[PDB]
Design a protein around this motif. Sequence first.
Motif: not given
Length: 134
Positions: A57-79
């Motif tokens: 999130x911080x990397x994309x925001x700094x670069x003004x990028x609207x790309x989504x992030x994929x993660x395979x972690x149900x847990x981390x996505x929820x957190x």
Amino acid sequence: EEIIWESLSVDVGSQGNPGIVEYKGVDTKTGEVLFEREPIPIGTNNMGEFLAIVHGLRYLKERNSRKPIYSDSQTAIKWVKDKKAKSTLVRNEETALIWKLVDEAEEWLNTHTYETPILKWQTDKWGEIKADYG
RNA sequence: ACAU
DNA sequence: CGATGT
Ligand SMILES: [K+]
Ligand SMILES: [K+]
Ligand SMILES: [Mn+2]
Ligand SMILES: [Mn+2]
């Protein structure tokens, strides 16, 4: 259904769980490594996955990028959605570093905004996430 | 059970 | 086989 190829994929790697934790983010389409975190001596798989998303999130925001992030972690996505990492890892001197990073990642989420979609990588359909350590 |  | 999580 279809992979969103214009995206950032993150993954955690560890030696033990709990154990040495690292993470990286890659261009989903090309596999180009965009960031890599220096190994953290003791953490959990889920702390690492959480840190990887927030760093994304911080990397994309700094670069003004609207790309989504994929993660395979149900847990981390929820957190990340909750802005709270509900880890069971004991707090002691050997875990102080990971807990400081997690605490600081939560603090960033509570003081910044983002529209970045955080998407589940569907391993069962698409195979291993492109940031995988193997 | 699901996700790691 | 063990551990981290919802
Ligand atoms: K991994
Ligand atoms: K389990
Ligand atoms: Mn993973
Ligand atoms: Mn992996």
